[PDB]
Amino acid sequence: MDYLVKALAYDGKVRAYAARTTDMVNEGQRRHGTWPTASAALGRTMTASLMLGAMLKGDDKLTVKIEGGGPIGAIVADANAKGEVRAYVSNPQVHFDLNAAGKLDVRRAVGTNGTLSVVKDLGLREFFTGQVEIVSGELGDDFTYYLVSSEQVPSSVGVGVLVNPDNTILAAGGFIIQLMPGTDDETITKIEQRLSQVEPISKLIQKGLTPEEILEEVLGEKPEILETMPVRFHCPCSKERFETAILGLGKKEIQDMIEEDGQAEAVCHFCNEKYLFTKEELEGLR
Amino acid sequence: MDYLVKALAYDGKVRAYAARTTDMVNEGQRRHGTWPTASAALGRTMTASLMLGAMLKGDDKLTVKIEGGGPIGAIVADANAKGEVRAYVSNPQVHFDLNAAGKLDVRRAVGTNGTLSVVKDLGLREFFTGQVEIVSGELGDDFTYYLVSSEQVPSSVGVGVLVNPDNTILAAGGFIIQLMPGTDDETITKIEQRLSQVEPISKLIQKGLTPEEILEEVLGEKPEILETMPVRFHCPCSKERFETAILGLGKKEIQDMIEEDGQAEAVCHFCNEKYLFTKEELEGLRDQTT
Amino acid sequence: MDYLVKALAYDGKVRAYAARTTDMVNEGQRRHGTWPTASAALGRTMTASLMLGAMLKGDDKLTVKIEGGGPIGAIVADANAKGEVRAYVSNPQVHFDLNAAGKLDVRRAVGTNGTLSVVKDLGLREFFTGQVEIVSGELGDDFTYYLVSSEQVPSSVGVGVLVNPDNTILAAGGFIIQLMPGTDDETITKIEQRLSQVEPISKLIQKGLTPEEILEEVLGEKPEILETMPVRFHCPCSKERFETAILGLGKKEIQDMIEEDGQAEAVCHFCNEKYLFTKEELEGLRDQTT
Amino acid sequence: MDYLVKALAYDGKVRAYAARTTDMVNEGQRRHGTWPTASAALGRTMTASLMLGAMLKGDDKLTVKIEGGGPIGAIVADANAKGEVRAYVSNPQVHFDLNAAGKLDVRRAVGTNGTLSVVKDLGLREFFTGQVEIVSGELGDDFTYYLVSSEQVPSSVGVGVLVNPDNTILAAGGFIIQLMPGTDDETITKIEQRLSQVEPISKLIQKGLTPEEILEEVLGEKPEILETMPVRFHCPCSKERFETAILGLGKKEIQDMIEEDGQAEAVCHFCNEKYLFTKEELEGLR
Ligand SMILES: [Zn+2]
Ligand SMILES: [Zn+2]
Ligand SMILES: [Zn+2]
Ligand SMILES: [Zn+2]
């Protein structure tokens, strides 16, 4: 039921993407136990990251790191060309009152003193990196700035997350609209005004609009859908793997951890799975 | 008379660039005293860099570095948004027998085990880097691979340099063509055919085709010109830069210079400009420095 | 009271370095507002860099860059031959649950897919670079691997940082031991035993062991001291540097600053020093710039 | 009969290397057809490079590139931990009169406006590089400067090549002496003076001294020999390999080269083996 669409509009002058990510954002919330404001920052990042990741091909993948000096600390999302995302926030426990407009105060959680970086991993010696300063802190506008100023593509990013009173996620989705080099300086203005006039993405997702519908409303025309794909929260961590974490400590600290408890545990930061090594298992190296 | 153009074609679905860089590549050859194979590697790199630079705006700028492990060492080119390039290679006097096609063996000079990287300065606190493997060593195809990797639109970079027996440059130029979204398949196979179907770019320049004409030839239609700009080899070094560096050595090292040599020649590695500090200049610096 | 020593031991067959860097790592923590795990990565890197720097002479200097792919991003440290370090991490507010040994999970912050590189400026036209894979992520072992790769003598780098619950630094220090040619096997197994047999370096510092005492403890004999030096966190940035950068933006961008903000804050990314340009200062710059 | 020794002296305070490279330098001369002055530059580079290469371990390897602006152009040598060297000069045809001292005028051939670089390849993302300016042009003293100033190890390099009237090589060999960190400022002076007083390496190789003997004369004591190994000119190029060169041109220039000659050739720059592709062979791609 979560998915992403790749689209064109205006006869190939607009390259567009849209997604519905309610289930994956709910899974992020549950795994990390984020408080509402942190959920909003997490889901906004996850959704934007997924759509960046969909711009990739094949086995290529990317990582977004945001750390604006606010109490949530660093937010990291991995996304790939298959629409698999894993993401965490460094401090899930962030509470503030609503802002003046009655929305979760994401910019106070994130902070605006630091950077948004995107690292694309194409192979062992092949990568593309980009970095800008966080100028908004609401995340959607920071991703816009990344696209416009580091990637130098005229773009508009909208991401929205609605949090239920019980702290679960009601809805999440977003879009990215990009104007291609060919676009005549006049059709640019038709789209820029219609974007500036349509309802914010949070309102659109509140009404239950699908990704195609969101693109149509925001664009003022039905888009050519190039591809739809399913998307999911996914983290490939496993116990064998955390072994290497534990191996990396050695035979000393390993002989300890035990002789003192008869066990040890390690935690995946992306998905919060916990791995317990029993006494027998720990002995299998020491 | 060297210059570059920015262009669209096929109702804005093709974005294109082209340049004639004979004079600037000749300046590089002259400054660094490259041998033919190395001039070809240097001038291909310069021309490709200039065109990437043309995709920037304002005061932005970029640096290309090729390090394939070959005898030429590193090839480094700075390019800004205003049509100015400076470039050097580690080892300018690099040359070989002609390759099996009777052309300059650029791949042998460059090496095929290493990377091509592009680092962009896009303003205070806006940063972009890319790095790809060298896949060819002939450079045109490497830049194509960098562009396709970077922007994931079909791209084609052509660059050429013809060198005279006296080691001077006879011609240099290039183009970049990129097919944006919504390019229909008729235009693709038009363009791809033309591409893998038309003459070498350095002979088009030698024939005296303009940048505009080259795009017409390659594209199959007259391009829409968005901008033309003069271009040149330029390094902003000056004697003052080197004076400052000599000062930073301290009195002792300077006095060594005066005593064993009576003078000092400082050389910019980017453009090989040579600056001479007389005994008296150096005495002034020894006495100025703390 | 932070300082570093240079030493020999076992009749000159062992070359050694040690430092107490509590205060400088505390300055880095404070400047950048690192969270515990990131302070440990930052301070380990700083201390290792300082000691590498101590192997240099004169005005020479070096830059360490760690890029393992982890959440902290890049860790960059400049170190000179005069005991001065500046360093930053991309993302200071990085932290996790304790690792399986109940210690700060530095490897998780750093990542284990990337490189550690060292670029040395050894004078006008003398250059040295090294780069190795990250093998651990815990940093001590990575620096050891860099040194063994570089000089091919048995080496050991220890570095530690203890952080308080309030995020301040309680202790930081380190050592490097290298076994030169002709070290007999009795001294090797002496040293290797001691090494893989003695307490953590950050607790030795907390206990209030000096650098000298730490080398004694690790080596099994009192070292011969060759040099002691004061050390510190220092970044030579100043408001003037940023003024110059603002000037370089042009009148228009500056006027935007004045109009939308009434002022401008410029921040050094190396040391996070914050410089404030009042409306009037900015008016001065807008009018000065061409 | 060519070989290299690894040594210590002065109870581990001196780390030393020496080699006899007459046969490999003769092979370089024959392959490239160097004229005498070029032979001297080539052999000096080969011998120094071999001894640098012996400092390496395992499968690690290095490349020395020298290009001083003189008529010989770029000199490149590869050397590995096994003492395999391959090396060429860009212009083998360099003639000058003898210098004032009656020796081949290597510095006029090489030139002193450019750099000596050494790249050590430890793996795909692992390398050490060093570069200095060429300050002598005679090569031995440039290698000394590389070791002293880039690698920061107090060192003395001696390399010598004697060329026969018939242009073949009569002798070639060299040494490197390094002073270790422990060396007391007084035993440094005993060695520095004895080095400054002994006969130049060309004279020593003229008299037929082996590597061990050269170390003993230059050191003033018999060295501890740690290892001896055989050394050779070796280049692993093959026809299959040059295929990739030719493949890298494509199917067009390939269809040509032929339809016009019925063949094509490519040449290894390091060893000057020539590879001929027949009409049938060229067709096996086009
Ligand atoms: Zn996980
Ligand atoms: Zn210059
Ligand atoms: Zn600073
Ligand atoms: Zn060969």
mmCIF file of N, CA, C and O in Angstrom, chain A residues 8 10-15 55-57 115 120 122 124-133 145 149-152 180-184, chain B residues 8 11-13 15 55-57 60 113-115 120 122 125-133 145-146 149-153 180-182:
data_model
loop_
_atom_site.group_PDB
_atom_site.id
_atom_site.type_symbol
_atom_site.label_atom_id
_atom_site.label_comp_id
_atom_site.label_asym_id
_atom_site.label_seq_id
_atom_site.Cartn_x
_atom_site.Cartn_y
_atom_site.Cartn_z
ATOM 1 N N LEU A 8 6.507 12.257 -15.640
ATOM 2 C CA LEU A 8 6.802 13.470 -16.392
ATOM 3 C C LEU A 8 5.547 14.246 -16.602
ATOM 4 O O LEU A 8 4.404 13.708 -16.549
ATOM 5 N N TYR A 10 4.206 18.232 -18.713
ATOM 6 C CA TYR A 10 4.502 19.371 -19.566
ATOM 7 C C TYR A 10 5.377 18.919 -20.716
ATOM 8 O O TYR A 10 6.383 19.544 -20.994
ATOM 9 N N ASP A 11 5.037 17.763 -21.272
ATOM 10 C CA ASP A 11 5.751 17.182 -22.402
ATOM 11 C C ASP A 11 7.256 17.022 -22.140
ATOM 12 O O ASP A 11 8.099 17.419 -22.971
ATOM 13 N N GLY A 12 7.589 16.436 -20.994
ATOM 14 C CA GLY A 12 8.979 16.152 -20.629
ATOM 15 C C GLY A 12 9.753 17.288 -20.028
ATOM 16 O O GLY A 12 10.886 17.098 -19.615
ATOM 17 N N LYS A 13 9.171 18.457 -19.901
ATOM 18 C CA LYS A 13 9.851 19.561 -19.213
ATOM 19 C C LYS A 13 9.864 19.464 -17.666
ATOM 20 O O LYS A 13 10.681 20.108 -17.009
ATOM 21 N N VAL A 14 8.920 18.730 -17.108
ATOM 22 C CA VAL A 14 8.859 18.496 -15.656
ATOM 23 C C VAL A 14 9.157 17.031 -15.480
ATOM 24 O O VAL A 14 8.503 16.168 -16.091
ATOM 25 N N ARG A 15 10.132 16.745 -14.626
ATOM 26 C CA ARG A 15 10.419 15.416 -14.153
ATOM 27 C C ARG A 15 9.912 15.376 -12.699
ATOM 28 O O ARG A 15 10.339 16.193 -11.895
ATOM 29 N N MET A 55 15.839 8.199 -7.779
ATOM 30 C CA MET A 55 16.543 8.811 -8.941
ATOM 31 C C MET A 55 17.720 7.995 -9.380
ATOM 32 O O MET A 55 18.312 8.307 -10.434
ATOM 33 N N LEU A 56 18.108 7.025 -8.536
ATOM 34 C CA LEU A 56 19.244 6.141 -8.734
ATOM 35 C C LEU A 56 18.889 4.957 -9.620
ATOM 36 O O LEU A 56 17.739 4.703 -9.838
ATOM 37 N N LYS A 57 19.905 4.260 -10.110
ATOM 38 C CA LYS A 57 19.684 3.085 -10.933
ATOM 39 C C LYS A 57 20.390 1.879 -10.355
ATOM 40 O O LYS A 57 21.411 1.988 -9.647
ATOM 41 N N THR A 115 24.577 20.841 8.659
ATOM 42 C CA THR A 115 24.556 20.478 7.229
ATOM 43 C C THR A 115 23.618 19.287 6.917
ATOM 44 O O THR A 115 23.258 18.508 7.805
ATOM 45 N N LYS A 120 26.225 9.471 -2.583
ATOM 46 C CA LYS A 120 25.765 8.408 -3.512
ATOM 47 C C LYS A 120 26.956 7.455 -3.738
ATOM 48 O O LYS A 120 28.057 7.861 -4.084
ATOM 49 N N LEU A 122 28.388 4.513 -5.764
ATOM 50 C CA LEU A 122 28.273 3.855 -7.065
ATOM 51 C C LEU A 122 29.252 2.692 -7.213
ATOM 52 O O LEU A 122 29.297 2.065 -8.298
ATOM 53 N N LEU A 124 33.261 0.970 -5.311
ATOM 54 C CA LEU A 124 34.289 1.144 -4.321
ATOM 55 C C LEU A 124 35.051 2.478 -4.399
ATOM 56 O O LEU A 124 35.400 3.132 -3.366
ATOM 57 N N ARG A 125 35.337 2.894 -5.638
ATOM 58 C CA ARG A 125 36.017 4.197 -5.895
ATOM 59 C C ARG A 125 35.158 5.194 -6.659
ATOM 60 O O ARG A 125 35.684 6.162 -7.318
ATOM 61 N N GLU A 126 33.841 5.000 -6.631
ATOM 62 C CA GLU A 126 32.925 5.829 -7.423
ATOM 63 C C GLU A 126 31.825 6.368 -6.510
ATOM 64 O O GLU A 126 31.168 5.584 -5.873
ATOM 65 N N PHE A 127 31.662 7.682 -6.444
ATOM 66 C CA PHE A 127 30.688 8.309 -5.526
ATOM 67 C C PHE A 127 30.431 9.711 -5.969
ATOM 68 O O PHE A 127 31.269 10.331 -6.707
ATOM 69 N N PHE A 128 29.296 10.233 -5.570
ATOM 70 C CA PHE A 128 28.920 11.646 -5.751
ATOM 71 C C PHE A 128 28.515 12.119 -4.399
ATOM 72 O O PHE A 128 27.716 11.417 -3.690
ATOM 73 N N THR A 129 29.015 13.269 -3.974
ATOM 74 C CA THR A 129 28.652 13.851 -2.672
ATOM 75 C C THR A 129 28.184 15.262 -2.884
ATOM 76 O O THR A 129 28.587 15.935 -3.861
ATOM 77 N N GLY A 130 27.294 15.722 -2.007
ATOM 78 C CA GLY A 130 26.792 17.070 -2.016
ATOM 79 C C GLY A 130 26.485 17.428 -0.578
ATOM 80 O O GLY A 130 26.100 16.558 0.206
ATOM 81 N N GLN A 131 26.634 18.685 -0.283
ATOM 82 C CA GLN A 131 26.398 19.235 1.044
ATOM 83 C C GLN A 131 25.933 20.673 0.940
ATOM 84 O O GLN A 131 26.604 21.481 0.258
ATOM 85 N N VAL A 132 24.896 21.022 1.716
ATOM 86 C CA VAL A 132 24.519 22.409 1.954
ATOM 87 C C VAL A 132 24.255 22.612 3.422
ATOM 88 O O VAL A 132 24.115 21.636 4.204
ATOM 89 N N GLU A 133 24.205 23.878 3.830
ATOM 90 C CA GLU A 133 23.791 24.229 5.156
ATOM 91 C C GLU A 133 22.280 24.029 5.301
ATOM 92 O O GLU A 133 21.536 24.235 4.368
ATOM 93 N N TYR A 145 16.704 23.028 -1.265
ATOM 94 C CA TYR A 145 17.952 23.773 -1.379
ATOM 95 C C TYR A 145 19.101 22.847 -1.824
ATOM 96 O O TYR A 145 19.818 23.182 -2.758
ATOM 97 N N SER A 149 20.835 23.830 -5.202
ATOM 98 C CA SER A 149 22.137 24.488 -5.018
ATOM 99 C C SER A 149 23.375 23.606 -5.055
ATOM 100 O O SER A 149 24.499 24.075 -5.335
ATOM 101 N N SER A 150 23.213 22.374 -4.660
ATOM 102 C CA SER A 150 24.329 21.428 -4.778
ATOM 103 C C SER A 150 24.140 20.653 -6.089
ATOM 104 O O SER A 150 25.093 20.596 -6.919
ATOM 105 N N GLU A 151 22.928 20.127 -6.334
ATOM 106 C CA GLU A 151 22.770 19.303 -7.512
ATOM 107 C C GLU A 151 22.468 20.204 -8.717
ATOM 108 O O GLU A 151 22.461 19.750 -9.829
ATOM 109 N N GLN A 152 22.192 21.466 -8.444
ATOM 110 C CA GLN A 152 21.915 22.476 -9.502
ATOM 111 C C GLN A 152 20.816 22.044 -10.449
ATOM 112 O O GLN A 152 20.947 22.116 -11.627
ATOM 113 N N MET A 180 13.170 20.944 -16.197
ATOM 114 C CA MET A 180 14.291 20.503 -17.006
ATOM 115 C C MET A 180 14.858 21.700 -17.792
ATOM 116 O O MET A 180 14.207 22.733 -17.917
ATOM 117 N N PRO A 181 16.099 21.575 -18.257
ATOM 118 C CA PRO A 181 16.794 22.664 -18.950
ATOM 119 C C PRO A 181 16.037 23.333 -20.080
ATOM 120 O O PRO A 181 16.251 24.527 -20.331
ATOM 121 N N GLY A 182 15.135 22.604 -20.709
ATOM 122 C CA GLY A 182 14.436 23.088 -21.867
ATOM 123 C C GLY A 182 13.334 24.058 -21.576
ATOM 124 O O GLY A 182 12.871 24.751 -22.497
ATOM 125 N N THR A 183 12.910 24.104 -20.315
ATOM 126 C CA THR A 183 11.664 24.758 -19.919
ATOM 127 C C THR A 183 11.723 26.264 -20.129
ATOM 128 O O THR A 183 12.544 26.939 -19.507
ATOM 129 N N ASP A 184 10.861 26.766 -21.015
ATOM 130 C CA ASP A 184 10.858 28.184 -21.434
ATOM 131 C C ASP A 184 10.475 29.112 -20.283
ATOM 132 O O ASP A 184 9.574 28.793 -19.521
ATOM 133 N N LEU B 8 20.502 24.896 -26.997
ATOM 134 C CA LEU B 8 19.454 23.863 -26.895
ATOM 135 C C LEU B 8 19.203 23.370 -28.292
ATOM 136 O O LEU B 8 19.541 24.041 -29.270
ATOM 137 N N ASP B 11 13.549 21.422 -29.711
ATOM 138 C CA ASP B 11 12.552 22.030 -28.832
ATOM 139 C C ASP B 11 12.925 21.920 -27.364
ATOM 140 O O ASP B 11 12.067 21.589 -26.548
ATOM 141 N N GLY B 12 14.187 22.185 -27.041
ATOM 142 C CA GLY B 12 14.650 22.121 -25.660
ATOM 143 C C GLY B 12 14.859 20.752 -25.025
ATOM 144 O O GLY B 12 15.196 20.700 -23.850
ATOM 145 N N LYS B 13 14.677 19.660 -25.743
ATOM 146 C CA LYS B 13 14.961 18.306 -25.233
ATOM 147 C C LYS B 13 16.481 17.944 -25.273
ATOM 148 O O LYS B 13 16.916 17.007 -24.604
ATOM 149 N N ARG B 15 20.312 19.484 -24.587
ATOM 150 C CA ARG B 15 21.139 20.570 -24.104
ATOM 151 C C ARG B 15 22.560 20.324 -24.611
ATOM 152 O O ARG B 15 23.075 19.198 -24.503
ATOM 153 N N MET B 55 28.751 24.916 -17.439
ATOM 154 C CA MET B 55 27.481 24.512 -16.828
ATOM 155 C C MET B 55 27.241 25.210 -15.457
ATOM 156 O O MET B 55 26.136 25.106 -14.841
ATOM 157 N N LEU B 56 28.298 25.838 -14.950
ATOM 158 C CA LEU B 56 28.259 26.596 -13.726
ATOM 159 C C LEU B 56 27.777 28.024 -13.969
ATOM 160 O O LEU B 56 27.727 28.511 -15.080
ATOM 161 N N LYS B 57 27.502 28.724 -12.891
ATOM 162 C CA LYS B 57 27.192 30.129 -13.027
ATOM 163 C C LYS B 57 27.933 31.001 -12.073
ATOM 164 O O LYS B 57 28.577 30.560 -11.125
ATOM 165 N N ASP B 60 31.147 30.516 -9.557
ATOM 166 C CA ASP B 60 31.430 29.185 -9.198
ATOM 167 C C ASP B 60 32.570 28.637 -10.024
ATOM 168 O O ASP B 60 32.877 29.167 -11.069
ATOM 169 N N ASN B 113 44.083 2.736 -14.720
ATOM 170 C CA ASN B 113 43.853 2.287 -13.378
ATOM 171 C C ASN B 113 43.892 3.433 -12.388
ATOM 172 O O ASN B 113 44.884 3.659 -11.731
ATOM 173 N N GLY B 114 42.733 4.048 -12.207
ATOM 174 C CA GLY B 114 42.572 5.267 -11.441
ATOM 175 C C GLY B 114 41.244 5.876 -11.720
ATOM 176 O O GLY B 114 40.294 5.252 -12.160
ATOM 177 N N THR B 115 41.157 7.155 -11.353
ATOM 178 C CA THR B 115 39.935 7.837 -11.272
ATOM 179 C C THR B 115 39.973 9.203 -11.988
ATOM 180 O O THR B 115 41.040 9.797 -12.199
ATOM 181 N N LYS B 120 33.439 20.721 -7.164
ATOM 182 C CA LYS B 120 32.811 22.016 -7.504
ATOM 183 C C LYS B 120 32.750 22.895 -6.248
ATOM 184 O O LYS B 120 32.270 22.425 -5.210
ATOM 185 N N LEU B 122 30.644 25.872 -5.262
ATOM 186 C CA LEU B 122 29.362 26.459 -5.657
ATOM 187 C C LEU B 122 28.898 27.635 -4.747
ATOM 188 O O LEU B 122 27.687 28.088 -4.785
ATOM 189 N N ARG B 125 29.715 27.405 1.599
ATOM 190 C CA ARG B 125 28.955 26.309 2.171
ATOM 191 C C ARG B 125 27.913 25.555 1.230
ATOM 192 O O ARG B 125 26.915 25.001 1.673
ATOM 193 N N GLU B 126 28.201 25.511 -0.078
ATOM 194 C CA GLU B 126 27.485 24.634 -0.983
ATOM 195 C C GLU B 126 28.607 23.856 -1.707
ATOM 196 O O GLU B 126 29.533 24.464 -2.244
ATOM 197 N N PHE B 127 28.584 22.517 -1.629
ATOM 198 C CA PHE B 127 29.718 21.673 -2.024
ATOM 199 C C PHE B 127 29.207 20.508 -2.912
ATOM 200 O O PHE B 127 28.051 20.028 -2.721
ATOM 201 N N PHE B 128 29.977 20.099 -3.902
ATOM 202 C CA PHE B 128 29.641 18.969 -4.726
ATOM 203 C C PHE B 128 30.920 18.320 -5.219
ATOM 204 O O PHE B 128 31.892 19.026 -5.568
ATOM 205 N N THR B 129 31.038 17.003 -5.025
ATOM 206 C CA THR B 129 32.126 16.231 -5.591
ATOM 207 C C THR B 129 31.624 15.001 -6.354
ATOM 208 O O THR B 129 30.665 14.371 -5.943
ATOM 209 N N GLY B 130 32.326 14.598 -7.408
ATOM 210 C CA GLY B 130 32.066 13.319 -8.077
ATOM 211 C C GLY B 130 33.370 12.649 -8.405
ATOM 212 O O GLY B 130 34.350 13.365 -8.683
ATOM 213 N N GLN B 131 33.365 11.316 -8.435
ATOM 214 C CA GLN B 131 34.503 10.550 -8.793
ATOM 215 C C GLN B 131 34.027 9.232 -9.437
ATOM 216 O O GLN B 131 33.128 8.581 -8.918
ATOM 217 N N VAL B 132 34.613 8.905 -10.586
ATOM 218 C CA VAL B 132 34.335 7.685 -11.297
ATOM 219 C C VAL B 132 35.636 7.021 -11.645
ATOM 220 O O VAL B 132 36.738 7.649 -11.741
ATOM 221 N N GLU B 133 35.548 5.743 -11.910
ATOM 222 C CA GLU B 133 36.710 5.052 -12.480
ATOM 223 C C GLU B 133 37.052 5.542 -13.889
ATOM 224 O O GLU B 133 36.204 5.872 -14.653
ATOM 225 N N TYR B 145 31.335 9.024 -19.352
ATOM 226 C CA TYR B 145 30.996 8.115 -18.264
ATOM 227 C C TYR B 145 30.780 8.884 -16.957
ATOM 228 O O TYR B 145 29.790 8.623 -16.240
ATOM 229 N N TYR B 146 31.626 9.882 -16.681
ATOM 230 C CA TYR B 146 31.389 10.813 -15.556
ATOM 231 C C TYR B 146 30.038 11.489 -15.675
ATOM 232 O O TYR B 146 29.249 11.450 -14.712
ATOM 233 N N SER B 149 27.088 8.928 -15.258
ATOM 234 C CA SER B 149 27.088 8.621 -13.810
ATOM 235 C C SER B 149 26.481 9.695 -12.936
ATOM 236 O O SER B 149 25.752 9.365 -11.984
ATOM 237 N N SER B 150 26.801 10.952 -13.222
ATOM 238 C CA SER B 150 26.413 12.131 -12.472
ATOM 239 C C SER B 150 24.883 12.466 -12.642
ATOM 240 O O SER B 150 24.153 12.630 -11.662
ATOM 241 N N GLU B 151 24.459 12.589 -13.906
ATOM 242 C CA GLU B 151 23.140 13.120 -14.235
ATOM 243 C C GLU B 151 22.181 12.051 -14.778
ATOM 244 O O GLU B 151 21.012 12.310 -14.952
ATOM 245 N N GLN B 152 22.667 10.863 -15.048
ATOM 246 C CA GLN B 152 21.844 9.777 -15.623
ATOM 247 C C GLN B 152 20.888 10.226 -16.765
ATOM 248 O O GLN B 152 19.677 9.904 -16.763
ATOM 249 N N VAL B 153 21.428 11.021 -17.701
ATOM 250 C CA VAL B 153 20.756 11.256 -18.983
ATOM 251 C C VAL B 153 21.786 10.784 -19.990
ATOM 252 O O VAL B 153 22.993 10.803 -19.679
ATOM 253 N N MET B 180 17.730 15.301 -22.546
ATOM 254 C CA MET B 180 16.830 15.435 -21.419
ATOM 255 C C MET B 180 15.570 14.500 -21.570
ATOM 256 O O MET B 180 15.221 13.989 -22.668
ATOM 257 N N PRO B 181 14.885 14.313 -20.467
ATOM 258 C CA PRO B 181 13.559 13.631 -20.456
ATOM 259 C C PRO B 181 12.568 14.079 -21.570
ATOM 260 O O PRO B 181 12.402 15.278 -21.871
ATOM 261 N N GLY B 182 11.898 13.110 -22.186
ATOM 262 C CA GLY B 182 10.888 13.418 -23.218
ATOM 263 C C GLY B 182 11.494 13.516 -24.613
ATOM 264 O O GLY B 182 10.795 13.789 -25.625
#
